[PDB]
Amino acid sequence: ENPMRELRIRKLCLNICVGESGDRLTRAAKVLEQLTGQTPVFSKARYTVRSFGIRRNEKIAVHCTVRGAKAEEILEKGLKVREYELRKNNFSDTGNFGFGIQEHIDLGIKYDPSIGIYGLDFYVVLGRPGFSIADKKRRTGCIGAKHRISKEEAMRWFQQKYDGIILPG
Amino acid sequence: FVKVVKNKAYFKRYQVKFRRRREGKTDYYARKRLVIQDKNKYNTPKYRMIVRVTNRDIICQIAYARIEGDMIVCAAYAHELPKYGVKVGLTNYAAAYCTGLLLARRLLNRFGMDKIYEGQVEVTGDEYNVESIDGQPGAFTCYLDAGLARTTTGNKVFGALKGAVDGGLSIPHSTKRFPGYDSESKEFNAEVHRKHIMGQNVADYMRYLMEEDEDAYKKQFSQYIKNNVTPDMMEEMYKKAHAAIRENPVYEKKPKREVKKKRWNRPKMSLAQKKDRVAQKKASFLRAQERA
Amino acid sequence: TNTKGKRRGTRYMFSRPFRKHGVVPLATYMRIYKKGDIVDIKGMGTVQKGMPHKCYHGKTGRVYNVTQHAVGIVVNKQVKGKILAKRINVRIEHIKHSKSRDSFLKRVKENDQKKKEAKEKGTWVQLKRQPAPPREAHFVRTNGKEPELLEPIPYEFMA
Amino acid sequence: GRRPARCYRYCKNKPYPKSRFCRGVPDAKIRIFDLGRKKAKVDEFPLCGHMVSDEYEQLSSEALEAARICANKYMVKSCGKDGFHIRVRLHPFHVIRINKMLTGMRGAFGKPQGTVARVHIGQVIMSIRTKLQNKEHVVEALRRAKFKFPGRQKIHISKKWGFTKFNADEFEDMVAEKRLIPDGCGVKYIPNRGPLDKWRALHS
RNA sequence: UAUCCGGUAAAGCGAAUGAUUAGAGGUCUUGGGGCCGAAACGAUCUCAACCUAUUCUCAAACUUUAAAUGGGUAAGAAGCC
RNA sequence: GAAACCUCCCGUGGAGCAGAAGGGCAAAAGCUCGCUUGAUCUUGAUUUUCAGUACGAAUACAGACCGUGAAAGCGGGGCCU
RNA sequence: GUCUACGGCCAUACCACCCUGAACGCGCCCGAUCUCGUCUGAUCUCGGAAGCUAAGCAGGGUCGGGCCUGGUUAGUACUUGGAUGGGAGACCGCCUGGGAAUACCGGGUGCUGUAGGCUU
Numbered sequence A: 001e002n003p004m005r006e007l008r009i010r011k012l013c014l015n016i017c018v019g020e021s022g023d024r025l026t027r028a029a030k031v032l033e034q035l036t037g038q039t040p041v042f043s044k045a046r047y048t049v050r051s052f053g054i055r056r057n058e059k060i061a062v063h064c065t066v067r068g069a070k071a072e073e074i075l076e077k078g079l080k081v082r083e084y085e086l087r088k089n090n091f092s093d094t095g096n097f098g099f100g101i102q103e104h105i106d107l108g109i110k111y112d113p114s115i116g117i118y119g120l121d122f123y124v125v126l127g128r129p130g131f132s133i134a135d136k137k138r139r140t141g142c143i144g145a146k147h148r149i150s151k152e153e154a155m156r157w158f159q160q161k162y163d164g165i166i167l168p169g
Numbered sequence B: 001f002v003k004v005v006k007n008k009a010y011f012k013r014y015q016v017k018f019r020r021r022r023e024g025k026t027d028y029y030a031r032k033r034l035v036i037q038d039k040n041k042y043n044t045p046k047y048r049m050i051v052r053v054t055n056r057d058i059i060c061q062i063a064y065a066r067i068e069g070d071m072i073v074c075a076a077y078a079h080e081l082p083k084y085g086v087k088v089g090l091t092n093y094a095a096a097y098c099t100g101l102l103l104a105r106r107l108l109n110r111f112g113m114d115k116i117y118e119g120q121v122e123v124t125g126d127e128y129n130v131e132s133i134d135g136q137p138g139a140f141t142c143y144l145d146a147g148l149a150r151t152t153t154g155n156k157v158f159g160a161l162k163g164a165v166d167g168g169l170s171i172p173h174s175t176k177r178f179p180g181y182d183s184e185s186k187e188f189n190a191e192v193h194r195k196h197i198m199g200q201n202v203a204d205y206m207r208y209l210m211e212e213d214e215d216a217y218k219k220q221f222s223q224y225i226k227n228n229v230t231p232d233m234m235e236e237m238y239k240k241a242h243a244a245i246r247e248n249p250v251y252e253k254k255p256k257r258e259v260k261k262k263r264w265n266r267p268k269m270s271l272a273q274k275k276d277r278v279a280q281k282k283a284s285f286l287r288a289q290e291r292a
Numbered sequence C: 001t002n003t004k005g006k007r008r009g010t011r012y013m014f015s016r017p018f019r020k021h022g023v024v025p026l027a028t029y030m031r032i033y034k035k036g037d038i039v040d041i042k043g044m045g046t047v048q049k050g051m052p053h054k055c056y057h058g059k060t061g062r063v064y065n066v067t068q069h070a071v072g073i074v075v076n077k078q079v080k081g082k083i084l085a086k087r088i089n090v091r092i093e094h095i096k097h098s099k100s101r102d103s104f105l106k107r108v109k110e111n112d113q114k115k116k117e118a119k120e121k122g123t124w125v126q127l128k129r130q131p132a133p134p135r136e137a138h139f140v141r142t143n144g145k146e147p148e149l150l151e152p153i154p155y156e157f158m159a
Numbered sequence D: 001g002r003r004p005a006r007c008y009r010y011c012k013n014k015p016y017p018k019s020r021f022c023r024g025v026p027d028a029k030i031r032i033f034d035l036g037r038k039k040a041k042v043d044e045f046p047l048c049g050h051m052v053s054d055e056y057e058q059l060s061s062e063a064l065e066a067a068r069i070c071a072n073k074y075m076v077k078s079c080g081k082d083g084f085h086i087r088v089r090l091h092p093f094h095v096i097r098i099n100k101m102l103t104g105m106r107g108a109f110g111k112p113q114g115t116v117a118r119v120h121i122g123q124v125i126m127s128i129r130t131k132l133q134n135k136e137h138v139v140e141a142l143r144r145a146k147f148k149f150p151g152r153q154k155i156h157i158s159k160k161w162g163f164t165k166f167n168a169d170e171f172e173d174m175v176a177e178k179r180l181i182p183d184g185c186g187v188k189y190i191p192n193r194g195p196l197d198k199w200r201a202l203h204s
Numbered sequence E: 001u002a003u004c005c006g007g008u009a010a011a012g013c014g015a016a017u018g019a020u021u022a023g024a025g026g027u028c029u030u031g032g033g034g035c036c037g038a039a040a041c042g043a044u045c046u047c048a049a050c051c052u053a054u055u056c057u058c059a060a061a062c063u064u065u066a067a068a069u070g071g072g073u074a075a076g077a078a079g080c081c
Numbered sequence F: 001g002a003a004a005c006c007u008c009c010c011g012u013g014g015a016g017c018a019g020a021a022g023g024g025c026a027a028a029a030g031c032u033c034g035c036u037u038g039a040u041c042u043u044g045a046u047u048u049u050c051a052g053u054a055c056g057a058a059u060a061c062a063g064a065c066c067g068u069g070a071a072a073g074c075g076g077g078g079c080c081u
Numbered sequence G: 001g002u003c004u005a006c007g008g009c010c011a012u013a014c015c016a017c018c019c020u021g022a023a024c025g026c027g028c029c030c031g032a033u034c035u036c037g038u039c040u041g042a043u044c045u046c047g048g049a050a051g052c053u054a055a056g057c058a059g060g061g062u063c064g065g066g067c068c069u070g071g072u073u074a075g076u077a078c079u080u081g082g083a084u085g086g087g088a089g090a091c092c093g094c095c096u097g098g099g100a101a102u103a104c105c106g107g108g109u110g111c112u113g114u115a116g117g118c119u120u
């Protein structure tokens, strides 16, 4: 009989790190835009790495943060391609989880020889009512303690909500 | 495991930030520029029209700063407004206007400049400001303390500021962030501004919801539907309130007495209680372990 | 031969004390100096506009001018053989009221009280101060118990 | 090779540690500041013989090491290979200098010759713990070790338990109290203060 | 007699910075070498760095502390009311 | 993959602030944007080196003409040396 | 008793975890038509008032860390002035006045200004 300790999805994060720049990245930005229904953001590199073939302030990745119902919907699709399995290590100690998909057309998108097959990266910021405290301007705070989502608590939310297994190893 | 970031050491070397900086209240960078006088002005005050919008309220205070703790010459709250006419939407831009206006009038009534400096009456919305009359006591002048509010176009603080300006305080300002001013053109309507001052932005939303879906309107404007505040009633309501403020701004409080004087709180546990309490935990551990 | 630089050797002087860095708390700014206020100068690291020179830190002097956010302040600086009363324009943040004078004003006020009264009475009262006189004749009662004997203690080597 | 010990004896200069500024310093002769059964428990060695200094003088790293070998050799030969623990309690930190002559006294400032310990009057140089059997064997060990140092140093047997800061008269009771708790060569003094959960680990 | 100024002596390093000894504890890390292992955070040691309490010993160009001696002012008619 | 991008947590500054080092600095003095030319015109006063001359460097004002900000303000080069 | 708004001094006010919060507040909270701003109504801006003290916030708790303040350390370390004092030196003792700092052990754990609530 808890009032608002209702573990919800605060946001869903999606990022395609092509690590190229130019055209490949502009191509991958269309994929997220088709998926999420909003323009994404290009992130640039921190610093040059001659190994990976990247340069400082060169656009490496594209990403986006989905919120609300659309984030619930896209999360659902992403678990369907993963078949509602995660692991213990897929959850972070902070009570967030995430998982890859190897190819976006699995979610439900049409391939093109140009706009190819960008594998991508789901990550779910779980939260509660009254987490905003941390990130507002004026009278800020820290979210107590018996209110912070545990790893265990986030696993059981997944185990209930999306009927998942959380396989061991 | 990792290196403990917050050691003895960490706390020994640690410096707190000021109390109100911790509480997330006082921008001391801005406070210094706002509040201190030029030393050659000496003890002449430096007033500021503080305006803060709470989740359910708008406060308007005039204050100068002394060393004991900035003194408040006058105040007006949005929750007073029921007296004057405003039943609902007390955090809205129109309410902000009333609340500011009321502060000016109440302030002016103290100094006897109620008859001099009527200020703007008809509410155009355009650039207005008070010229001090010669052979008469000059116009009161303070400055707007926005606080931590993101000072954008249409911010409710500037709703209050507009009010106190029309009320007859000379507070300097531009019209670059009254609601009306256009970013991609750079002119000011001052009929858009009037609408906002009169609550027509709210009335139209009320009319838009009722047209589309009854239930959402019923949900959105529940206290507006109770008290029977309708879209077509709205403009009149705020104009009545403006007049009533303008005719009597004086605050009378309530004669508070008949207090039982009882402790809701929990007082501080005395040394000796604390001293025994460990004594009992020490015993209780010993007697407990001498069994299994 | 040492460098003539303005700030040479103020590593410690202009350095906010331990756990008193950051915002210059506001009383400092908002307290009023008139003409002829006795004022002790004490440079500060946070505010670098209007800093006094390292020679006038510690030194007390009188205010002569007061601008918008600073105070002209005559202070006496010795130079080999000659003391030069000279006038410096310190920004408020590096300056306090020197209490040195207030204890004097307290005493003169107390004298004016004790001069007005004791005039109608007739009994004249000691207005001048007097240094601590020798400590008067008095008895000491070794009440019952006798004195406690103190033998010096025998040496031993600890370390 | 190096200068006589004569020439670097009195604590004349300011202390000049190996640092950013003083660099290219040759490594100290002495390195291993303790030897014998150092992996021993407080209980199984309470004697604490010290060689205390009685001159505000500088001791060479060279002379420390030599004194350390001298004492340990005798301790081994006397009682046994694992029957003591010796602690040297002066590390050569001060860097000593050397203006060398093939210009004259122009631009004379030394290169780092070597390191040195500065030792105050009443400061301990070496210290030894072993058994109540073995008092005399330590004394002579420190006695022999004196001859490697310049100046003058008393040999003294402290009123502490082992290399602890606690007076040996009260050491055993304190353990019975659990004021004190064995902790390798040392002993952790527990006080009242800390949360009661620490107190519940003891008494259980 | 009031009142400011100070960062030297000393002291400190279970307080920062840098130095530095030892054992307790720790698969934190991970390794490189082993021994018993096909191999296994399996067992057993080990030495690397890191960390949890302790511990040895230091600083002209480090310091939480912090003297003595020391430098300002002030102690009235150019003042009070 | 030890290093690419994203996300949550801790983080008294252990980063950064053109350069030596010292000081100073966290809803900044750091970073990122928006608008800019106060690095403009003009009297004296003062500080620092000092002989208490110059130079340079700086501090407080004052008068103009601007900038920016809702405003209080800040700005006549570079946080200070 | 206690809160809100603006505060002064800035840890006796910080951090950690634990418990309790009547009324009024303060919040979280529900929305994006308009103002405003985002990749994203998360923040920011704006319009609300169905829920709830879970969190923030307050008050308390902990043989808590930390900070503050006493003791001890110690008349010890240091030190002004003195001697045709000692000592081969290094250094030390006395006279004359001044006099610290850890470890260790106690106690304390925000005070308060202006304006306005609530407990009628």
Ligand SMILES: [Mg+2]
Residues within 6 Å of the ligand: B030
């Ligand atoms: Mg501001």
Ligand SMILES: [Mg+2]
Residues within 6 Å of the ligand: none
């Ligand atoms: Mg020879």
Ligand SMILES: [Mg+2]
Residues within 6 Å of the ligand: D012, D013, D014
């Ligand atoms: Mg020398």
Ligand SMILES: [Mg+2]
Residues within 6 Å of the ligand: none
């Ligand atoms: Mg110095």
Ligand SMILES: [Mg+2]
Residues within 6 Å of the ligand: none
């Ligand atoms: Mg020293």
Ligand SMILES: [Mg+2]
Residues within 6 Å of the ligand: none
């Ligand atoms: Mg700059």
Ligand SMILES: [Mg+2]
Residues within 6 Å of the ligand: none
């Ligand atoms: Mg000007």
Ligand SMILES: [Mg+2]
Residues within 6 Å of the ligand: G041
């Ligand atoms: Mg929202």
Ligand SMILES: [Mg+2]
Residues within 6 Å of the ligand: G053
């Ligand atoms: Mg709560």
Ligand SMILES: [Mg+2]
Residues within 6 Å of the ligand: none
């Ligand atoms: Mg609660």
Ligand SMILES: [Mg+2]
Residues within 6 Å of the ligand: none
């Ligand atoms: Mg405590």
